[PDB]
């Protein structure tokens, strides 16, 4: 599915995403923004490693999560890839929880850096209810 701004913004909210490890929930929008276009079924296939991105994160399957056709690949949020696929994010939002529970956390995902870090992102929540 591809979500509403402000009905993913309450979504991420009640699934306890709002300052997880000290990440506002507008830098979580910004992120799922600039990923997916709030888009549970993306995917980006990466052929310089043979690694595909799933899902509104677009978490990458080379650490993350098994989709059994990366090589050297490994699964460190214990999921199947399908289970970042699916309309209902929890799996997805467990899954971003445990990526940014590593060291560099929000910053794990290469595109926050470009398009969201040292940004203004409250606009992704304008209106809410968040
Ligand atoms: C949290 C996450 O999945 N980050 C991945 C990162 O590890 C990978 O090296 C980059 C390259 O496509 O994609 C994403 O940023």
Do not use: E, L, M
């Given at each position: 599915k591809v979500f509403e701004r402000c009905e993913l913004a309450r979504t991420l909210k009640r699934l306890g995403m709002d300052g997880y490890r000290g990440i506002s929930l507008a830098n979580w929008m910004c992120l799922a923004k600039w990923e997916?276009?709030?888009?549970?079924r993306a995917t980006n296939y990466?052929?310089?490693?043979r690694s595909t991105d799933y899902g509104i994160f677009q978490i990458?399957?080379?650490?993350?999560?098994?989709?059994?056709?990366?090589?050297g690949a490994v699964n460190a949020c214990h999921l199947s890839c399908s289970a970042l696929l699916q309309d209902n994010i929890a799996d997805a939002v467990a899954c971003a929880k445990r990526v940014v529970?590593?060291?560099?956390?929000?910053?794990?995902?290469?595109a926050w850096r470009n398009?969201?870090?040292?940004?203004?992102?409250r606009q992704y929540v304008q209106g809410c209810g968040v």
């Open positions: 997916s276009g709030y888009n549970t990466n052929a310089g490693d990458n399957s080379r650490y993350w999560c098994n989709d059994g056709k990366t090589p529970r590593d060291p560099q956390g929000i910053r794990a995902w290469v398009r969201c870090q040292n940004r203004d992102v």
